[PDB]
Protein backbone atom coordinates (compact mmCIF):
# COMPACT_ATOMS: atom_id res chain seq x y z
CA UNK A 1 0.00 0.00 0.00
CA UNK A 2 0.88 3.71 0.10
CA UNK A 3 3.46 3.24 2.92
CA UNK A 4 5.51 1.45 0.24
CA UNK A 5 4.72 4.23 -2.36
CA UNK A 6 4.00 1.78 -5.24
CA UNK A 7 3.68 4.74 -7.67
CA UNK A 8 7.10 6.22 -6.75
CA UNK A 9 9.37 3.44 -5.44
CA UNK A 10 11.12 2.90 -8.82
CA UNK A 11 11.58 6.66 -9.45
CA UNK A 12 12.98 6.86 -5.91
CA UNK A 13 15.31 3.89 -6.34
CA UNK A 14 16.71 5.36 -9.62
CA UNK A 15 17.21 8.75 -7.90
CA UNK A 16 19.05 7.25 -4.91
CA UNK A 17 21.36 5.38 -7.33
CA UNK A 18 22.18 8.73 -8.96
CA UNK A 19 22.67 10.49 -5.62
CA UNK A 20 24.85 7.80 -4.05
CA UNK A 21 27.37 8.47 -6.82
CA UNK A 22 27.26 12.23 -6.04
CA UNK A 23 27.51 11.72 -2.26
CA UNK A 24 30.36 9.19 -2.48
CA UNK A 25 33.54 9.84 -0.42
CA UNK A 26 37.00 9.77 -2.01
CA UNK A 27 38.08 6.09 -1.73
CA UNK A 28 41.68 6.92 -0.92
CA UNK A 29 41.17 9.84 1.49
CA UNK A 30 42.79 8.26 4.51
CA UNK A 31 46.31 7.96 3.06
CA UNK A 32 46.07 11.69 2.28
CA UNK A 33 45.26 12.38 5.97
CA UNK A 34 48.67 12.93 7.69
CA UNK A 35 47.54 12.61 11.31
CA UNK A 36 44.56 10.21 11.20
CA UNK A 37 44.18 6.52 10.23
CA UNK A 38 41.46 3.97 9.52
CA UNK A 39 41.89 2.74 13.10
CA UNK A 40 41.10 6.18 14.53
CA UNK A 41 38.04 6.47 12.27
CA UNK A 42 36.83 3.07 13.46
CA UNK A 43 37.12 4.19 17.10
CA UNK A 44 35.09 7.31 16.23
CA UNK A 45 32.36 5.43 14.39
CA UNK A 46 32.05 2.84 17.17
CA UNK A 47 31.59 5.74 19.61
CA UNK A 48 28.87 7.22 17.38
CA UNK A 49 27.09 3.85 17.55
CA UNK A 50 27.17 4.11 21.36
CA UNK A 51 25.95 7.72 21.25
CA UNK A 52 23.12 6.55 18.95
CA UNK A 53 22.25 3.92 21.57
CA UNK A 54 22.50 6.25 24.55
CA UNK A 55 20.05 8.69 22.92
CA UNK A 56 17.91 6.13 21.08
CA UNK A 57 18.57 7.71 17.71
CA UNK A 58 17.51 6.07 14.47
CA UNK A 59 20.01 3.88 12.66
CA UNK A 60 19.45 6.14 9.64
CA UNK A 61 20.89 9.04 11.66
CA UNK A 62 24.01 6.97 12.36
CA UNK A 63 24.46 6.27 8.63
CA UNK A 64 23.98 9.92 7.62
CA UNK A 65 26.59 11.02 10.18
CA UNK A 66 29.22 8.64 8.82
CA UNK A 67 28.40 9.81 5.26
CA UNK A 68 28.94 13.41 6.40
CA UNK A 69 32.19 12.52 8.24
CA UNK A 70 33.68 10.63 5.28
CA UNK A 71 32.71 13.39 2.80
CA UNK A 72 34.24 16.01 5.13
CA UNK A 73 37.46 14.08 5.64
CA UNK A 74 37.63 13.75 1.83
CA UNK A 75 38.57 17.44 1.45
CA UNK A 76 39.62 18.58 4.98
CA UNK A 77 42.73 17.45 6.88
CA UNK A 78 42.00 17.05 10.57
CA UNK A 79 44.35 16.56 13.56
CA UNK A 80 43.56 13.54 15.75
CA UNK A 81 42.50 15.86 18.62
CA UNK A 82 39.80 17.38 16.36
CA UNK A 83 38.43 14.20 14.79
CA UNK A 84 35.77 13.81 17.50
CA UNK A 85 34.64 17.40 17.01
CA UNK A 86 33.92 16.61 13.36
CA UNK A 87 32.07 13.44 14.38
CA UNK A 88 30.06 15.31 17.03
CA UNK A 89 29.00 18.03 14.59
CA UNK A 90 28.11 15.43 11.98
CA UNK A 91 25.92 13.54 14.47
CA UNK A 92 24.20 16.83 15.40
CA UNK A 93 23.44 17.64 11.77
CA UNK A 94 22.28 14.11 11.06
CA UNK A 95 20.00 14.33 14.12
CA UNK A 96 18.42 17.64 13.09
CA UNK A 97 17.81 16.22 9.62
CA UNK A 98 16.54 12.77 10.50
CA UNK A 99 15.16 12.85 14.08
CA UNK A 100 11.71 13.86 15.30
CA UNK A 101 13.33 14.95 18.59
CA UNK A 102 17.11 15.58 18.06
CA UNK A 103 19.23 15.81 21.25
CA UNK A 104 20.04 19.38 22.25
CA UNK A 105 23.48 20.79 21.48
CA UNK A 106 24.29 20.73 25.20
CA UNK A 107 23.78 16.96 25.11
CA UNK A 108 26.31 16.61 22.29
CA UNK A 109 28.75 18.76 24.32
CA UNK A 110 28.12 16.51 27.34
CA UNK A 111 28.88 13.24 25.45
CA UNK A 112 32.34 14.57 24.44
CA UNK A 113 33.21 14.64 28.20
CA UNK A 114 33.82 18.39 27.90
CA UNK A 115 36.61 17.87 25.35
CA UNK A 116 34.97 20.70 23.36
CA UNK A 117 32.85 23.78 24.04
CA UNK A 118 29.37 24.54 22.75
CA UNK A 119 30.92 27.30 20.62
CA UNK A 120 33.29 24.76 19.09
CA UNK A 121 30.51 22.32 18.30
CA UNK A 122 28.43 25.09 16.72
CA UNK A 123 31.32 26.49 14.65
CA UNK A 124 32.11 22.98 13.43
CA UNK A 125 28.41 22.48 12.54
CA UNK A 126 28.76 25.60 10.39
CA UNK A 127 32.04 24.40 8.81
CA UNK A 128 30.52 21.01 7.96
CA UNK A 129 27.52 22.68 6.33
CA UNK A 130 29.89 24.85 4.27
CA UNK A 131 32.09 21.95 3.17
CA UNK A 132 29.09 19.76 2.17
CA UNK A 133 27.31 22.80 0.73
CA UNK A 134 24.21 21.70 2.78
CA UNK A 135 23.96 18.55 0.66
CA UNK A 136 22.62 16.43 3.56
CA UNK A 137 19.88 14.19 1.99
CA UNK A 138 22.40 11.44 1.19
CA UNK A 139 21.43 7.83 0.34
CA UNK A 140 22.40 5.32 3.01
CA UNK A 141 22.78 1.55 3.14
CA UNK A 142 19.55 1.62 5.16
CA UNK A 143 17.57 3.41 2.46
CA UNK A 144 18.37 0.60 -0.01
CA UNK A 145 17.94 -2.29 2.48
CA UNK A 146 14.43 -1.31 3.49
CA UNK A 147 13.48 -1.42 -0.22
CA UNK A 148 15.23 -4.75 -0.79
CA UNK A 149 13.28 -6.09 2.24
CA UNK A 150 10.03 -5.68 0.25
CA UNK A 151 11.29 -8.52 -2.01
CA UNK A 152 11.34 -11.18 0.72
CA UNK A 153 8.88 -14.06 0.30
CA UNK A 154 7.61 -13.94 3.03
CA UNK A 155 8.95 -11.19 5.35
CA UNK A 156 11.38 -12.35 8.03
CA UNK A 157 12.51 -10.15 10.94
CA UNK A 158 15.72 -12.11 11.62
CA UNK A 159 16.78 -11.52 7.98
CA UNK A 160 15.96 -7.80 8.19
CA UNK A 161 17.77 -7.37 11.53
CA UNK A 162 20.80 -9.39 10.43
CA UNK A 163 21.12 -7.33 7.23
CA UNK A 164 20.98 -4.08 9.23
CA UNK A 165 23.75 -5.41 11.49
CA UNK A 166 26.07 -6.42 8.68
CA UNK A 167 25.49 -3.03 7.04
CA UNK A 168 26.35 -1.32 10.32
CA UNK A 169 29.56 -3.37 10.67
CA UNK A 170 30.69 -1.96 7.29
CA UNK A 171 30.52 1.62 8.62
CA UNK A 172 33.42 0.76 10.93
CA UNK A 173 36.11 -0.19 8.43
CA UNK A 174 36.94 2.40 5.77
CA UNK A 175 39.19 -0.23 4.27
CA UNK A 176 37.63 -1.88 2.47
CA UNK A 177 34.11 -0.50 2.58
CA UNK A 178 34.88 3.02 1.28
CA UNK A 179 35.28 1.45 -2.15
CA UNK A 180 31.65 0.20 -2.21
CA UNK A 181 28.46 2.18 -2.88
CA UNK A 182 25.65 2.03 -0.26
CA UNK A 183 23.50 0.14 -2.77
CA UNK A 184 26.10 -2.62 -3.21
CA UNK A 185 26.96 -3.04 0.48
CA UNK A 186 23.20 -3.21 1.09
CA UNK A 187 22.85 -5.89 -1.56
CA UNK A 188 25.73 -7.92 -0.09
CA UNK A 189 24.24 -7.53 3.40
CA UNK A 190 20.77 -8.59 2.29
CA UNK A 191 22.09 -11.64 0.44
CA UNK A 192 24.36 -12.70 3.28
CA UNK A 193 21.60 -12.25 5.87
CA UNK A 194 19.08 -14.16 3.74
CA UNK A 195 21.56 -16.96 3.09
CA UNK A 196 22.54 -17.14 6.77
CA UNK A 197 18.99 -17.31 8.10
CA UNK A 198 17.03 -19.18 5.37
CA UNK A 199 19.56 -20.73 2.98
CA UNK A 200 18.18 -18.64 0.09
CA UNK A 201 19.96 -16.27 -2.31
CA UNK A 202 19.65 -12.79 -3.77
CA UNK A 203 16.26 -12.94 -5.61
CA UNK A 204 15.77 -12.57 -9.33
CA UNK A 205 13.20 -9.84 -8.50
CA UNK A 206 16.07 -7.73 -7.12
CA UNK A 207 18.22 -8.54 -10.13
CA UNK A 208 15.34 -6.95 -12.11
CA UNK A 209 15.24 -3.89 -9.84
CA UNK A 210 18.94 -3.25 -9.31
CA UNK A 211 20.75 -4.84 -12.24
CA UNK A 212 23.08 -6.47 -9.70
CA UNK A 213 23.78 -10.23 -9.70
CA UNK A 214 25.73 -12.46 -7.32
CA UNK A 215 28.58 -12.01 -9.82
CA UNK A 216 28.58 -8.21 -9.45
CA UNK A 217 28.14 -8.43 -5.63
CA UNK A 218 30.84 -11.13 -5.27
CA UNK A 219 33.79 -8.86 -4.21
CA UNK A 220 31.77 -7.03 -1.47
CA UNK A 221 30.12 -10.33 -0.31
CA UNK A 222 33.61 -11.85 0.26
CA UNK A 223 34.74 -8.80 2.28
CA UNK A 224 31.48 -8.64 4.26
CA UNK A 225 31.68 -12.38 4.85
CA UNK A 226 35.21 -12.01 6.33
CA UNK A 227 33.97 -9.06 8.35
CA UNK A 228 31.11 -11.19 9.80
CA UNK A 229 33.45 -14.10 10.56
CA UNK A 230 35.98 -11.88 12.36
CA UNK A 231 33.43 -9.69 14.12
CA UNK A 232 33.90 -11.25 17.63
CA UNK A 233 37.64 -10.41 17.41
CA UNK A 234 37.34 -6.87 16.00
CA UNK A 235 38.75 -4.16 18.31
CA UNK A 236 35.37 -2.37 18.09
CA UNK A 237 32.37 -4.21 19.58
CA UNK A 238 29.60 -1.63 20.07
CA UNK A 239 27.58 -2.86 17.07
CA UNK A 240 27.74 -6.49 18.24
CA UNK A 241 26.57 -5.39 21.73
CA UNK A 242 23.79 -3.29 20.24
CA UNK A 243 22.48 -6.15 18.06
CA UNK A 244 22.35 -8.61 20.98
CA UNK A 245 19.24 -6.63 22.03
CA UNK A 246 15.78 -8.13 21.46
CA UNK A 247 14.80 -4.94 19.59
CA UNK A 248 17.00 -6.45 16.84
CA UNK A 249 16.05 -10.07 17.47
CA UNK A 250 19.47 -10.76 19.04
CA UNK A 251 20.94 -11.27 15.56
CA UNK A 252 24.54 -10.63 16.61
CA UNK A 253 24.26 -14.01 18.34
CA UNK A 254 23.47 -15.90 15.08
CA UNK A 255 26.39 -18.03 13.83
CA UNK A 256 27.89 -16.85 10.48
CA UNK A 257 28.03 -19.51 7.68
CA UNK A 258 31.51 -20.98 7.13
CA UNK A 259 31.15 -20.79 3.30
CA UNK A 260 28.96 -18.92 0.79
CA UNK A 261 29.04 -21.51 -2.04
CA UNK A 262 29.98 -19.07 -4.83
Amino acid sequence: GVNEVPDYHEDIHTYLREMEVKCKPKVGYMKKQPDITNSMRAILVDWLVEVGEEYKLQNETLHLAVNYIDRFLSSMSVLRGKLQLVGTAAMLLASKFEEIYPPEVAEFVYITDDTYTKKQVLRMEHLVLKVLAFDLAAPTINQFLTQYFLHQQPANCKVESLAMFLGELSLIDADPYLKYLPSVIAAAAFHLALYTVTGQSWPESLVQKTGYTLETLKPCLLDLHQTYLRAPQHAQQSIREKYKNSKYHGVSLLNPPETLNV
Binding site: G1, V2, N3, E4, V5, D7, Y8, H9, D11, I12, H13, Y15, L16, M19, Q58, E60, L92, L93, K96, F97, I100, P102, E104, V105, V121, L122, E125, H126, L129, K130, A133, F134, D135, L136, A137, N142, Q143, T146, Q147, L150
Partner: protein, 296 residues
Protein backbone atom coordinates in the same frame (compact mmCIF):
# COMPACT_ATOMS: atom_id res chain seq x y z
CA UNK B 1 27.80 29.26 -3.77
CA UNK B 2 27.95 32.48 -5.91
CA UNK B 3 26.29 35.46 -4.15
CA UNK B 4 26.99 38.04 -1.42
CA UNK B 5 24.68 40.67 0.10
CA UNK B 6 26.62 43.51 -1.53
CA UNK B 7 24.98 42.62 -4.88
CA UNK B 8 21.40 42.76 -3.61
CA UNK B 9 19.28 45.85 -2.98
CA UNK B 10 16.29 45.27 -0.66
CA UNK B 11 13.07 46.68 -2.14
CA UNK B 12 10.41 45.96 0.51
CA UNK B 13 9.35 43.35 3.09
CA UNK B 14 6.97 40.81 1.57
CA UNK B 15 6.30 38.31 4.33
CA UNK B 16 7.27 36.71 7.60
CA UNK B 17 7.47 33.28 9.17
CA UNK B 18 8.61 31.73 12.45
CA UNK B 19 11.55 31.27 10.05
CA UNK B 20 12.36 35.02 10.13
CA UNK B 21 11.41 37.58 7.48
CA UNK B 22 11.17 37.65 3.66
CA UNK B 23 12.26 40.61 1.50
CA UNK B 24 11.79 41.39 -2.15
CA UNK B 25 15.14 42.40 -3.59
CA UNK B 26 16.99 43.08 -6.81
CA UNK B 27 20.31 41.70 -8.04
CA UNK B 28 22.10 44.91 -8.97
CA UNK B 29 24.37 43.22 -11.54
CA UNK B 30 21.94 40.91 -13.38
CA UNK B 31 18.66 42.78 -12.73
CA UNK B 32 17.04 39.67 -11.27
CA UNK B 33 14.28 40.13 -8.71
CA UNK B 34 14.47 37.65 -5.84
CA UNK B 35 12.92 36.79 -2.48
CA UNK B 36 15.49 36.88 0.38
CA UNK B 37 14.59 34.76 3.37
CA UNK B 38 16.63 35.70 6.45
CA UNK B 39 17.31 33.06 9.13
CA UNK B 40 19.18 34.75 12.05
CA UNK B 41 21.62 32.50 13.94
CA UNK B 42 23.01 34.63 16.79
CA UNK B 43 19.42 34.64 18.13
CA UNK B 44 19.24 30.82 18.11
CA UNK B 45 21.19 28.86 20.78
CA UNK B 46 21.06 25.41 19.15
CA UNK B 47 22.86 26.61 16.00
CA UNK B 48 21.40 26.18 12.52
CA UNK B 49 17.67 25.30 12.86
CA UNK B 50 16.49 21.92 11.58
CA UNK B 51 13.71 23.56 9.58
CA UNK B 52 16.39 25.46 7.67
CA UNK B 53 18.69 22.42 7.22
CA UNK B 54 15.74 20.52 5.74
CA UNK B 55 14.57 23.40 3.52
CA UNK B 56 18.02 23.99 2.01
CA UNK B 57 19.11 20.33 1.60
CA UNK B 58 15.76 19.36 0.09
CA UNK B 59 15.29 22.37 -2.24
CA UNK B 60 18.89 22.03 -3.59
CA UNK B 61 17.80 18.73 -5.20
CA UNK B 62 14.30 19.68 -6.40
CA UNK B 63 14.69 21.56 -9.69
CA UNK B 64 11.20 21.75 -11.25
CA UNK B 65 9.09 24.53 -12.88
CA UNK B 66 6.36 24.13 -10.24
CA UNK B 67 8.70 24.21 -7.24
CA UNK B 68 10.03 27.62 -6.14
CA UNK B 69 13.71 27.63 -6.96
CA UNK B 70 16.42 28.12 -4.33
CA UNK B 71 19.05 30.15 -6.23
CA UNK B 72 21.66 30.49 -3.51
CA UNK B 73 22.61 30.42 0.17
CA UNK B 74 24.63 33.22 1.82
CA UNK B 75 26.07 31.67 5.02
CA UNK B 76 27.69 34.32 7.21
CA UNK B 77 28.46 33.53 10.86
CA UNK B 78 25.81 36.14 11.82
CA UNK B 79 22.99 35.46 9.32
CA UNK B 80 21.71 32.83 6.84
CA UNK B 81 20.22 34.35 3.65
CA UNK B 82 18.23 32.11 1.34
CA UNK B 83 17.91 33.54 -2.18
CA UNK B 84 14.77 32.45 -4.02
CA UNK B 85 13.08 33.19 -7.28
CA UNK B 86 10.45 35.87 -6.66
CA UNK B 87 6.69 35.41 -7.29
CA UNK B 88 4.38 38.40 -6.69
CA UNK B 89 1.46 36.55 -5.15
CA UNK B 90 0.11 33.56 -3.18
CA UNK B 91 -3.11 31.61 -3.98
CA UNK B 92 -4.78 32.71 -0.76
CA UNK B 93 -4.34 36.44 -1.52
CA UNK B 94 -5.43 35.87 -5.14
CA UNK B 95 -8.56 34.09 -3.91
CA UNK B 96 -9.45 36.88 -1.44
CA UNK B 97 -8.64 39.87 -3.58
CA UNK B 98 -9.31 39.13 -7.25
CA UNK B 99 -11.47 36.01 -7.18
CA UNK B 100 -14.66 37.72 -5.94
CA UNK B 101 -16.95 36.27 -8.63
CA UNK B 102 -14.81 33.18 -8.81
CA UNK B 103 -11.72 31.63 -10.28
CA UNK B 104 -12.63 30.67 -13.89
CA UNK B 105 -12.50 26.90 -14.44
CA UNK B 106 -9.67 27.07 -17.10
CA UNK B 107 -7.44 28.69 -14.45
CA UNK B 108 -8.50 26.22 -11.70
CA UNK B 109 -7.65 23.38 -14.03
CA UNK B 110 -4.29 24.93 -14.99
CA UNK B 111 -3.32 25.54 -11.34
CA UNK B 112 -4.39 22.11 -10.14
CA UNK B 113 -2.46 20.46 -13.00
CA UNK B 114 0.69 22.42 -12.19
CA UNK B 115 0.35 21.66 -8.45
CA UNK B 116 0.15 17.95 -9.26
CA UNK B 117 3.24 18.18 -11.48
CA UNK B 118 5.16 19.83 -8.64
CA UNK B 119 3.96 17.35 -6.03
CA UNK B 120 4.57 14.32 -8.25
CA UNK B 121 8.15 15.56 -8.66
CA UNK B 122 8.56 15.85 -4.85
CA UNK B 123 7.24 12.33 -4.26
CA UNK B 124 9.50 10.94 -7.02
CA UNK B 125 12.44 12.51 -5.12
CA UNK B 126 11.29 10.98 -1.78
CA UNK B 127 10.12 14.34 -0.31
CA UNK B 128 6.85 14.91 1.60
CA UNK B 129 5.88 18.58 1.71
CA UNK B 130 3.50 18.34 4.72
CA UNK B 131 2.13 21.91 4.67
CA UNK B 132 0.29 22.38 1.40
CA UNK B 133 -2.17 25.24 1.79
CA UNK B 134 -2.93 28.30 -0.39
CA UNK B 135 -0.58 30.62 1.58
CA UNK B 136 2.28 28.33 0.47
CA UNK B 137 1.40 28.24 -3.24
CA UNK B 138 2.92 31.14 -5.13
CA UNK B 139 1.77 32.56 -8.43
CA UNK B 140 3.67 34.68 -11.00
CA UNK B 141 2.51 37.10 -13.74
CA UNK B 142 2.91 34.38 -16.43
CA UNK B 143 0.28 32.05 -14.88
CA UNK B 144 2.64 29.60 -13.13
CA UNK B 145 1.85 28.36 -9.61
CA UNK B 146 4.61 26.74 -7.51
CA UNK B 147 5.04 24.83 -4.22
CA UNK B 148 6.79 26.92 -1.58
CA UNK B 149 7.93 26.74 2.02
CA UNK B 150 9.71 23.43 2.54
CA UNK B 151 10.42 24.08 6.27
CA UNK B 152 7.98 21.35 7.29
CA UNK B 153 9.09 18.95 4.53
CA UNK B 154 10.91 15.68 5.13
CA UNK B 155 12.98 13.18 3.15
CA UNK B 156 11.26 9.80 3.44
CA UNK B 157 12.41 6.19 3.19
CA UNK B 158 10.65 3.27 1.46
CA UNK B 159 8.65 1.98 3.22
CA UNK B 160 8.07 5.02 5.47
CA UNK B 161 8.81 4.88 9.16
CA UNK B 162 7.11 6.98 11.86
CA UNK B 163 7.64 10.74 11.47
CA UNK B 164 6.46 13.86 13.31
CA UNK B 165 2.76 13.63 14.24
CA UNK B 166 0.18 16.42 13.93
CA UNK B 167 1.93 17.93 10.86
CA UNK B 168 0.01 19.90 8.20
CA UNK B 169 -2.03 23.02 9.04
CA UNK B 170 -5.23 21.69 10.61
CA UNK B 171 -7.68 22.61 7.85
CA UNK B 172 -5.53 20.75 5.30
CA UNK B 173 -4.65 17.76 7.49
CA UNK B 174 -5.45 14.19 6.42
CA UNK B 175 -7.71 11.83 8.44
CA UNK B 176 -4.90 9.30 9.02
CA UNK B 177 -2.87 12.03 10.76
CA UNK B 178 -5.93 13.09 12.78
CA UNK B 179 -6.50 9.48 13.94
CA UNK B 180 -2.93 9.13 15.15
CA UNK B 181 -1.81 6.44 12.64
CA UNK B 182 1.77 5.16 13.16
CA UNK B 183 2.62 5.73 9.47
CA UNK B 184 1.73 8.30 6.89
CA UNK B 185 2.91 8.80 3.37
CA UNK B 186 2.55 10.67 0.08
CA UNK B 187 -1.25 10.42 0.40
CA UNK B 188 -1.19 13.20 3.06
CA UNK B 189 -0.06 15.76 0.42
CA UNK B 190 -2.81 14.61 -1.94
CA UNK B 191 -5.42 15.14 0.77
CA UNK B 192 -4.20 18.73 1.24
CA UNK B 193 -4.37 19.34 -2.53
CA UNK B 194 -7.91 17.93 -2.59
CA UNK B 195 -8.91 20.45 0.09
CA UNK B 196 -7.19 23.14 -2.02
CA UNK B 197 -8.99 22.03 -5.22
CA UNK B 198 -12.33 22.40 -3.47
CA UNK B 199 -11.27 25.79 -2.03
CA UNK B 200 -10.36 27.17 -5.45
CA UNK B 201 -13.92 26.48 -6.63
CA UNK B 202 -15.75 27.93 -3.57
CA UNK B 203 -13.04 30.31 -2.25
CA UNK B 204 -13.72 28.97 1.25
CA UNK B 205 -11.95 26.20 3.19
CA UNK B 206 -13.58 22.79 2.71
CA UNK B 207 -13.06 21.69 6.36
CA UNK B 208 -12.43 24.71 8.69
CA UNK B 209 -12.11 22.93 12.04
CA UNK B 210 -11.02 24.58 15.32
CA UNK B 211 -9.57 21.46 16.95
CA UNK B 212 -8.43 17.96 16.00
CA UNK B 213 -11.80 16.42 16.95
CA UNK B 214 -13.85 19.20 15.30
CA UNK B 215 -11.76 18.76 12.13
CA UNK B 216 -12.49 15.01 12.15
CA UNK B 217 -16.17 15.66 12.74
CA UNK B 218 -16.42 18.16 9.86
CA UNK B 219 -14.76 15.65 7.54
CA UNK B 220 -17.09 12.84 8.72
CA UNK B 221 -20.22 15.03 8.23
CA UNK B 222 -19.12 15.68 4.63
CA UNK B 223 -17.72 12.34 3.46
CA UNK B 224 -19.50 10.04 5.95
CA UNK B 225 -18.06 8.48 9.09
CA UNK B 226 -15.63 5.79 7.77
CA UNK B 227 -16.03 2.09 8.72
CA UNK B 228 -14.09 -1.09 7.95
CA UNK B 229 -15.69 -1.32 4.47
CA UNK B 230 -14.59 2.08 3.19
CA UNK B 231 -11.36 1.97 5.20
CA UNK B 232 -9.92 -1.37 6.46
CA UNK B 233 -8.03 -0.75 9.74
CA UNK B 234 -9.80 2.53 10.60
CA UNK B 235 -11.48 1.19 13.77
CA UNK B 236 -8.06 -0.06 14.96
CA UNK B 237 -6.36 3.34 14.63
CA UNK B 238 -4.87 4.69 17.91
CA UNK B 239 -7.23 7.69 18.14
CA UNK B 240 -10.30 6.03 16.59
CA UNK B 241 -13.13 5.80 19.13
CA UNK B 242 -16.27 3.56 18.87
CA UNK B 243 -18.28 6.52 20.30
CA UNK B 244 -17.67 8.46 17.05
CA UNK B 245 -21.04 9.63 15.60
CA UNK B 246 -21.92 7.73 12.45
CA UNK B 247 -22.76 10.29 9.76
CA UNK B 248 -24.05 9.25 6.34
CA UNK B 249 -21.93 10.09 3.30
CA UNK B 250 -23.69 12.78 1.34
CA UNK B 251 -23.93 12.99 -2.48
CA UNK B 252 -20.63 14.45 -3.65
CA UNK B 253 -22.47 16.87 -5.96
CA UNK B 254 -23.66 18.52 -2.72
CA UNK B 255 -20.10 18.91 -1.42
CA UNK B 256 -19.07 21.26 -4.24
CA UNK B 257 -22.27 21.97 -6.24
CA UNK B 258 -20.67 23.96 -9.13
CA UNK B 259 -18.25 21.13 -9.98
CA UNK B 260 -18.80 19.05 -13.18
CA UNK B 261 -18.74 15.22 -13.31
CA UNK B 262 -14.98 14.93 -14.11
CA UNK B 263 -14.21 17.46 -11.36
CA UNK B 264 -16.28 15.53 -8.81
CA UNK B 265 -14.63 12.29 -9.85
CA UNK B 266 -11.12 13.65 -9.40
CA UNK B 267 -11.98 15.38 -6.10
CA UNK B 268 -13.54 12.22 -4.67
CA UNK B 269 -10.36 10.28 -5.48
CA UNK B 270 -8.17 12.90 -3.75
CA UNK B 271 -10.35 12.78 -0.62
CA UNK B 272 -10.61 8.98 -0.34
CA UNK B 273 -10.51 7.85 3.29
CA UNK B 274 -8.21 4.93 2.66
CA UNK B 275 -4.67 6.33 1.99
CA UNK B 276 -3.94 3.20 -0.06
CA UNK B 277 -6.83 4.03 -2.46
CA UNK B 278 -6.37 7.82 -2.60
CA UNK B 279 -5.12 8.81 -6.04
CA UNK B 280 -1.37 9.55 -6.45
CA UNK B 281 -0.23 12.91 -7.98
CA UNK B 282 1.33 10.95 -10.85
CA UNK B 283 -1.98 9.16 -11.66
CA UNK B 284 -4.14 12.31 -11.18
CA UNK B 285 -2.24 13.98 -14.04
CA UNK B 286 -4.05 11.72 -16.50
CA UNK B 287 -7.54 12.32 -15.08
CA UNK B 288 -10.08 13.40 -17.79
CA UNK B 289 -10.61 16.61 -15.79
CA UNK B 290 -7.39 17.85 -17.41
CA UNK B 291 -8.28 16.81 -20.98
CA UNK B 292 -8.65 20.43 -22.23
CA UNK B 293 -5.98 22.05 -20.00
CA UNK B 294 -4.10 25.26 -20.82
CA UNK B 295 -1.86 27.68 -18.83
CA UNK B 296 -3.47 31.21 -18.76
Amino acid sequence: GPGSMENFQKVEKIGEGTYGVVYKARNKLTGEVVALKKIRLDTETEGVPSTAIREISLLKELNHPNIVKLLDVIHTENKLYLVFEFLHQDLKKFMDASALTGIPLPLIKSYLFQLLQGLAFCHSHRVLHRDLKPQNLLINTEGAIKLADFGLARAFGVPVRTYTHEVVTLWYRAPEILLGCKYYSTAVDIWSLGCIFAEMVTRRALFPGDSEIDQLFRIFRTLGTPDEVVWPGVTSMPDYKPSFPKWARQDFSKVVPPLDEDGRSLLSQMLHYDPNKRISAKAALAHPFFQDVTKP
